[PDB]
Amino acid sequence: YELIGLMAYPIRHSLSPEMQNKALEKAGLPFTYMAFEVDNDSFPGAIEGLKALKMRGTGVSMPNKQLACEYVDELTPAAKLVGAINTIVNDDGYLRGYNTDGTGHIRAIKESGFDIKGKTMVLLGAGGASTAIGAQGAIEGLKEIKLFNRRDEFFDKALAFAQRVNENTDCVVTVTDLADQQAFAEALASADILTNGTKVGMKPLENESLVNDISLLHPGLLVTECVYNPHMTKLLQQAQQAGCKTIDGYGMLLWQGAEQFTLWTGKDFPLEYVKQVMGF
Numbered sequence: 382y383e384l385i386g387l388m389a390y391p392i393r394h395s396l397s398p399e400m401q402n403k404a405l406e407k408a409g410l411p412f413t414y415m416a417f418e419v420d421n422d423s424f425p426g427a428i429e430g431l432k433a434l435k436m437r438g439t440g441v442s443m444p445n446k447q448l449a450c451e452y453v454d455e456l457t458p459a460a461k462l463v464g465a466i467n468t469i470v471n472d473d474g475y476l477r478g479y480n481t482d483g484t485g486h487i488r489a490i491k492e493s494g495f496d497i498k499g500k501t502m503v504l505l506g507a508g509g510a511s512t513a514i515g516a517q518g519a520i521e522g523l524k525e526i527k528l529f530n531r532r533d534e535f536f537d538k539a540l541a542f543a544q545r546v547n548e549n550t551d552c553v554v555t556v557t558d559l560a561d562q563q564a565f566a567e568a569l570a571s572a573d574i575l576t577n578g579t580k581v582g583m584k585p586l587e588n589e590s591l592v593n594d595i596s597l598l599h600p601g602l603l604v605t606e607c608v609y610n611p612h613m614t615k616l617l618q619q620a621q622q623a624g625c626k627t628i629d630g631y632g633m634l635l636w637q638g639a640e641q642f643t644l645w646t647g648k649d650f651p652l653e654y655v656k657q658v659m660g661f
């Protein structure tokens with residue numbers, strides 16, 4: 382019976398413990414998932430314990446996702462471009478880091494029956510979610526990433542990000558300011574998919590979308606949301622509008638968790654049962 386952890390501060394918020402523990406039980410796997418209060422100062426010590434105690438792995442979240450990069454042996458092509466991970470797997474002393482937010486959101490897409498090979502994505506954000514999604518999307522075959530980020534702390538992260546993807550991928554990424562309501566509207570027109578990776582659409586701001594008009598969207602478009610609180614973001618409302626195919630936050634949240642599960646467990650995630658149980 383091995384231990385799988387969550388290293389973060391705070392942790393009161395996490396849905397991972399209930400989610401993983403429930404998939405683990407309804408499959409009779411010998412693993413337990415426990416959250417632990419861990420910031421940057423205690424993280425090195427915690428990784429030390431993960432090895433000495435022979436834990437199976439641990440989920441990683443704020444504020445250690447970037448720092449955790451320095452404590453693993455093997456990062457993934459995508460992780461390397463993101464510069465952050467949320468999952469560590471201990472393979473008998475050997476530690477491999479991954480970013481399941483990205484694979485999860487992308488997986489959610491391939492699962493709706495949409496191919497991302499050769500498509501153009503219009504990405505909103507450059508934070509943790511956005512860059513993870515962009516990175517994995519580029520590595521699975523995206524032709525273009527029309528990233529739109531404003532003049533805040535993240536713009537420069539966008540460039541370097543755009544920088545890395547270009548330097549090691551076949552994908553072309555362009556960063557463009559989000560107040561340019563036009564080169565954007567036209568960006569949305571060249572796109573097959575629109576992905577919201579911004580906090581916009583979440584409580585308090587459960588009433589604000591990054592797309593002014595509804596006519597800026599089009600019917601054959603796929604719009605994906607990272608926000609799962611609530612279920613129907615303003616952006617998802619404007620989408621169901623234009624007749625767009627939609628994918629919600631619980632999509633990225635469920636598949637992301639399946640990825641960690643299979644990574645630690647080796648078995649398939651009772652995705653179906655967990656969706657029930659968590660009340661989605």
Ligand SMILES: NC(=O)C1=CN([C@@H]2O[C@H](COP(=O)(O)OP(=O)(O)OC[C@H]3O[C@@H](n4cnc5c(N)ncnc54)[C@H](O)[C@@H]3O)[C@@H](O)[C@H]2O)C=CC1
Pocket residue numbers: 482506507508509510511530531533535559578579580581583607608609630631633634635637
């Ligand atoms: N369903 C799921 O599995 C997950 C959902 N998320 C959600 O995705 C969102 C992004 O979270 P993170 O990347 O972790 O946080 P973050 O703080 O790193 O990134 C937020 C991003 O939003 C942009 N942004 C924030 N306010 C903005 C505004 N007013 N206008 C334009 N851009 C703005 C910033 O440029 C930044 O890059 C959150 O709402 C989070 O709850 C995050 C992880 C998983």
